[PDB]
Write a protein that binds this ligand. Sequence first.
Ligand SMILES: Nc1nc2c(ncn2[C@@H]2O[C@H](COP(=O)(O)OP(=O)(O)OP(=O)(O)O)[C@@H](O)[C@H]2O)c(=O)[nH]1
Ligand SMILES: Nc1nc2c(ncn2[C@@H]2O[C@H](COP(=O)(O)OP(=O)(O)OP(=O)(O)O)[C@@H](O)[C@H]2O)c(=O)[nH]1
Ligand SMILES: Nc1nc2c(ncn2[C@@H]2O[C@H](COP(=O)(O)OP(=O)(O)O)[C@@H](O)[C@H]2O)c(=O)[nH]1
Ligand SMILES: Nc1nc2c(ncn2[C@@H]2O[C@H](COP(=O)(O)OP(=O)(O)O)[C@@H](O)[C@H]2O)c(=O)[nH]1
Lengths: 428, 428, 434, 434
Amino acid sequence: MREIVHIQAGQCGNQVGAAFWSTIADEHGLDSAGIYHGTSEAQHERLNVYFNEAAGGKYVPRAVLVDLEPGTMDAVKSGKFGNLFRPDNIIYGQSGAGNIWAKGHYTEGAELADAVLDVVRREAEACDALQGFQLTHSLGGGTGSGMGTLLLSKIREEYPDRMMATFSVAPAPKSSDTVVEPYNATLSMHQLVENSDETFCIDNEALSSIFANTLKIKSPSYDDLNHLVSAVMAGVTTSFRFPGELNSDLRKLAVNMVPFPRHFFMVGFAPLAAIGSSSFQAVSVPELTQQMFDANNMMVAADPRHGRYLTVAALFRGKVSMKEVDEQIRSVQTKNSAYFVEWIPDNVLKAVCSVPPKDLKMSATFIGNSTSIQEIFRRLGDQFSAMFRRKAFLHWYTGEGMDEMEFTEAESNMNDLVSEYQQYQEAG
Amino acid sequence: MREIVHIQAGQCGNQVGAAFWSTIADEHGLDSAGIYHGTSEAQHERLNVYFNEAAGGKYVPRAVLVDLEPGTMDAVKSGKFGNLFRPDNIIYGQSGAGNIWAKGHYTEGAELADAVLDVVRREAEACDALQGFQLTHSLGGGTGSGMGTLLLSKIREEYPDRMMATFSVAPAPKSSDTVVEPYNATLSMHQLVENSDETFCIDNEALSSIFANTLKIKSPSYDDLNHLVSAVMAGVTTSFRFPGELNSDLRKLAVNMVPFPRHFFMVGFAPLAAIGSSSFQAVSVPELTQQMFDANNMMVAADPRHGRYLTVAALFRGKVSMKEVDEQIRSVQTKNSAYFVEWIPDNVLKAVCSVPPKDLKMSATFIGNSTSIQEIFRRLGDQFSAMFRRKAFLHWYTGEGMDEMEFTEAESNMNDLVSEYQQYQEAG
Amino acid sequence: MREVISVHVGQAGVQIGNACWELYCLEHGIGPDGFPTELNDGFGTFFSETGQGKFVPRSIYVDLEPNVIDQVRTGPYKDLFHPEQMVTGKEDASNNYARGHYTVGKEMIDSVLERIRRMADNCSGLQGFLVFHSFGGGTGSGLGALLLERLNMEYGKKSNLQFSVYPAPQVSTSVVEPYNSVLTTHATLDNSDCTFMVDNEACYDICRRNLDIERPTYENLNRLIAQVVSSITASLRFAGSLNVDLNEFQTNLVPYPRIHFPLVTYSPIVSAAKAFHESNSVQEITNQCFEPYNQMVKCDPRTGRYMATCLLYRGDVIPRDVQAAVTSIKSRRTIQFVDWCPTGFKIGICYEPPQHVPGSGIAKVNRAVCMLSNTTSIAEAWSRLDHKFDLMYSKRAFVHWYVGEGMEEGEFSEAREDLAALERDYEEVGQDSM
Amino acid sequence: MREVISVHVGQAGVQIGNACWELYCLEHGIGPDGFPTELNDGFGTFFSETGQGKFVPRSIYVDLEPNVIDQVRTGPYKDLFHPEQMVTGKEDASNNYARGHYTVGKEMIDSVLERIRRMADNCSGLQGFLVFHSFGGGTGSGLGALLLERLNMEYGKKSNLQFSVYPAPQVSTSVVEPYNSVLTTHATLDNSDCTFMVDNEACYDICRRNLDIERPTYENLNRLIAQVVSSITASLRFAGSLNVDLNEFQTNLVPYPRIHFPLVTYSPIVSAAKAFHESNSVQEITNQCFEPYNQMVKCDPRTGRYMATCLLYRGDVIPRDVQAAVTSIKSRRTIQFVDWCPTGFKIGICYEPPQHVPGSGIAKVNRAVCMLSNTTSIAEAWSRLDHKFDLMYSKRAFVHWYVGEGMEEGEFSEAREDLAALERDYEEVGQDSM
Ligand SMILES: Nc1nc2c(ncn2[C@@H]2O[C@H](COP(=O)(O)OP(=O)(O)OP(=O)(O)O)[C@@H](O)[C@H]2O)c(=O)[nH]1
Ligand SMILES: Nc1nc2c(ncn2[C@@H]2O[C@H](COP(=O)(O)OP(=O)(O)OP(=O)(O)O)[C@@H](O)[C@H]2O)c(=O)[nH]1
Ligand SMILES: Nc1nc2c(ncn2[C@@H]2O[C@H](COP(=O)(O)OP(=O)(O)O)[C@@H](O)[C@H]2O)c(=O)[nH]1
Ligand SMILES: Nc1nc2c(ncn2[C@@H]2O[C@H](COP(=O)(O)OP(=O)(O)O)[C@@H](O)[C@H]2O)c(=O)[nH]1
């Protein structure tokens, strides 16, 4: 019944579970205890996606929370929601990853990979029909950046028809975590592009701009940060997980987007407001569409005004027509006609879902494609290569088992991406 | 539906909002809370002008209150009516303007202009059809005198069909605020004449004469001063904003007035009385017309008896005929026939609106044109040029980015105005 | 079925019809909701009936304000029209001919011209169509002159009547009434078959004396013009004694294709106490209809000589009291001459008594007279305009706001020129020799 | 008993029938549970009855989602169908022709083809069968084109009608609507006897003006297409005056076997307040059905010349008001010519009045018109596709996701080629000389 098995990796790659899973329970009317409490009968017919049925209504979240160090793993165990996940799927090593890629990709995950795949296999064939797999991790760290990629390439070597879809979070332009965060980003992209289809890129610093610019809070914390970018994982399945009028799926959101095997694009929300900014509007699709236009409601630290929109899919939920979107999309595609790609007339995808979220009459989820996602990788590439000139921190990788020229290959892998996005910025 | 988006600038340029907006709510039957309380069904069919519709009847005032210093901006925020405006449109800088023109026009507003235009654009295309824009500010200060003009010239460079109409307040003949108030007045007129159509000129000192001469209060304050000159902003839209028998609009009040691109004329009220002077009259159109004749019921500190009436438009509200105005306008145009301009026979415009204001059976709004508005600028020009002879206070302008001979140009710009009004004082 | 349709452009053309159709609904027993009836052909005259029994007033409404039009749907006639026929405009720039003509009013025309079309697709016996506007309007002067010039371009031989209203000799309603009125007599010169025009200040002058009300309004002036309409139209919608067609006027008023500006004289207009203590016989009315006290247009028709004049009588009329009256007018010095018609009359008799609306202060009467008088004097209000309009143009006053809306001043160069031939035409008819 | 069966493939084909059968149940007095009745042959027309008195709608449902199909068993028609006929698919890869055609949709076919079989084993008088899909679908475009090509391979001479819906000139629902729609006119070229297609944005254009609702939905568009169905089908399921068979269309619309794309024009479609203040006679409707305001497909049928057009009338109709109307269309300039039929019409009369569903804002009427118009202009939306589709193929955009699902691009090489002959065919009929 078109279902997904969930995979996390890394510390903050595991932190996103609670913003995900407590929402998707609340989106499906489900408590902390797992037992059922839902209002409408609308929220059942596609409930089977992110949940395996249980004895006595428990409705276990199909997930495997994976990490290399037991620091943050007990935190969601010993905290609340300690009875949602089944601890057979909680696995974690003890020795530190040191957030070094090949330590996390090549060798210490290989201590734990043998326990990984026997977990997800018996999860896979107990499902009816897999729709796909989700990988949420980091680009910057080591555990999520390294171990999930080796974890990915085995799964893509087992299920070549099944779709592989990934979420990940970006290195920052200014607010970076560590100094090998250039190396981890390049090495992560070497496996994402080759194995999985689609990956999205979320700057924490641009996420920090959101509550700064839009919601006006001087001091949010990460439990507000993941709480916001949670709902796009809700939003991509919003179309899917309960009925509507039109909606399609992530594989149908895969083939429509890109004319090539080269899949990266953007994320945004609609609507969005502050505390006191709530009631002073008229929340509607013209209110929705303009928070689906700015870079300020995006996640990528790159300018669509520097870029060009390849393809757009829009995912609405609530009482919403088409012509309220039609007349409004036409009102903004005309003034911004040079912002579209002339390879495709009408690269707009419309999808209308039924029920609203909590306390909001409408909601929309943004998917727009760009040429300026190279503005990440050009900002990455010279951030990468300048730390290769003196072979910066090289012995923490070649002192673990990887050839240095294998690291040089991923540069051209990044440059193979940019070489295409060099063209469709200005060609045709 | 023939609608207006509102713009203020400067401290007292923002003070006029409460005298405006609490009246136009009360003129439309609307509370402090924004939610609807109106008696007749008469006050709805043109309610859409100064208000954007909202969710739950809130009916937000379409306004953007703009300033350079956060002194007086919080005062209407933290005071009452703090839930009328939406705070997304409340913008204000922190560093002082020092009420110096090019500091407010050229450079510090340029810190805030980038946030200005993205506010009014999304306000503009969310409207049905713009009727125009209102700019209310000061001539004497820096923020309203400077920043709104640079704000104006971008809008007039965006919407060349849409009408630009401005209210402003004059330097005083005797009761002046500051000593650069000559410079700010000249520099403000350099942008008003070139960009917008019409501007009106209100002396505070002549306004101080009104409660002195007519209403007999020794000590009014500014919250009585703006409260009086509020109702002409009501009066110019009185014809427009709810039905009647004949009425026209401000663009129709633009093309009828002036035979040239040179647009300035006067403001007055009818009726008007004191506290105990209320019931001792017979309030009617002959009572209205004679308070539409004196300089004492005007606003400009200039003599129409020194001047000559180019064109006149009258805007009545209440139960009122035409012949009660006709026989009365003919009774005063004959005794004062030399006071009219012989280029145009019958430069009178009649417009009759329906419902009366609060507790008054009739009301009228005065529009009369003059030749003696040069009596402002001649009083300005030698007040200007005498502070150029020694280059008075010149380093607070050229120490900010403007060439001194650019300041000399606006003198001839003032002298280009007076050169025409030199003629039609006595010619033809 | 000998049927005709009436357009309404301009804010005057709004409120004029609000008296005209009110009279029309009372002159057939039509309830104000359209669903009527609280002659034989009469019950379906101005009205393309549906089988539901209510019926559409065959009209149209043209305005670029939504202001005064939506007063009707607020007002008591909310079920009379239908919301296709009542075409509004969302925005307006009125008092501006050459954008109400050439920019903003033209965007309504293709929507307007369709609604002319289907209403011409039921009225099998079509007698041209009727036009209401003003000169004191911008857009009614503006779109109205544009309205005729494609319809007469379409409909060719069809009849074109209009009841206009022009800015007074003494009281204007706007300063543009030299400008954005006097040019519109270009397009309406060669598109209006006949036309008619009337003064407020003359009609107000009747109100202070023959109606004796110190403070009247537009509505009372609207009611007074409105009976002149039904004196012409609904007379053929009622089986009279000597029937008068619409087409008879345009062939009994013009010797020459330009001269189609007659007068209006309506009488008796008699106040409430004035009808009592008084017998108004038919010659008592016709001796008033040549006296200037019931005169609709503030001019001097005494001084000028009359040209040709049709008369329409309502109610209980004999032709003997006509000929006993009308042989006294031609004897009397207060007319002197026609040279070009030794008779100079057209007499018409319909039996339907004068309809008396309840609200206004007009009084009921058992006989009525309508007068359409061509003269050698009516060009003086035109000469008033030439005294006015050539003075404004002696300064070039917002030629920009005739230019910037999209028209050069070559028509203003043509403006007095066509007016000059109109002045030349009355002295041409003023030529009376061998 | 002159009976026919309607397949439903594609998510459009789901919701289209949810208006069609709703109309079908109201047009025979059928309770929504199937157990009916809160003409003679009429009570058993679309329905293979059981002795229990409830009866099966002779349909099928094909979709590869379980999503929208299971809404029916949640919805109020839970007892109407039966859970053999309603065949779903457990998984889906839609917007993907060549696996909905060649990989994933083909696994349902042997289950589908059995259910075609036994429903053809009771309907003794079989008149072909009816096909619903979309072009904006993947699988309804995908499995649908595959659905015809074996059925017409089986059933040979049997009738093949389909009501399609294509991606608009202005608003798409997906980017694949160049790709995974325009190829499906290959298989449906030589497997559909006749076909029909309609636009949302044109049907939405009717909703803002003739229905006057700012925010409509699919369901209202579903109800509007649905009456066109029963205007054709149930007309022979009712004893009319000049009966029209299904087989008459496919021999009165095509001079040549390719040209089977007519128009749809349905009228009157009249809003709630619009029916009041209005009499819609039959020629009042037919003068609207040639005007583009009631036009179903956003094209230019004014510019092109009409070829041949059958008409279907419901309710209280005389042929004299037909011939009085239809002699005015052929006179009028808004059509100019047929060269290949000097008559160019087919007239058909059924007495059953237009069914008026309660919920939607459509208004009731006592007469109806359906129009199926062949023209010399309908290939321009095809030429819109050739402007679109040849541009996508000028980059080879997920040819892999046409290849990797199991088909080389030789059909894409064939794609514009068969389209080019379609464009060549209308200029071939555009040849009008000696
Ligand atoms: N409504 C109305 N107008 C009258 C009447 N009598 C004279 N008028 C003239 O009709 C004109 C009305 O047109 P406008 O004043 O321009 O109002 P409007 O809606 O802008 O009309 P348009 O220019 O056609 O759009 C006025 O100038 C009056 O001079 C009357 O009784 N009723
Ligand atoms: N259900 C429905 N679809 C409509 C309607 N009107 C137009 N459509 C079109 O129908 C298409 C629906 O097919 P899909 O969007 O592909 O949904 P689906 O379940 O994947 O359909 P398949 O591809 O056949 O499996 C859309 O592209 C719309 O363009 C309508 O009223 N109802
Ligand atoms: N999703 C998410 N990521 C974060 C947050 N804060 C920091 N990060 C990034 O997530 C990564 C956290 O590092 P870590 O999880 O230890 O990397 P690991 O070695 O793969 O486990 C770093 O690269 C941070 O840049 C957050 O609140 N949410
Ligand atoms: N509208 C208004 N203006 C005033 C009042 N009192 C003083 N002014 C004038 O308004 C200006 C106030 O200066 P300010 O607003 O600080 O100038 P700014 O630099 O543009 O903000 C001065 O030029 C005064 O002459 C008042 O009560 N109402």
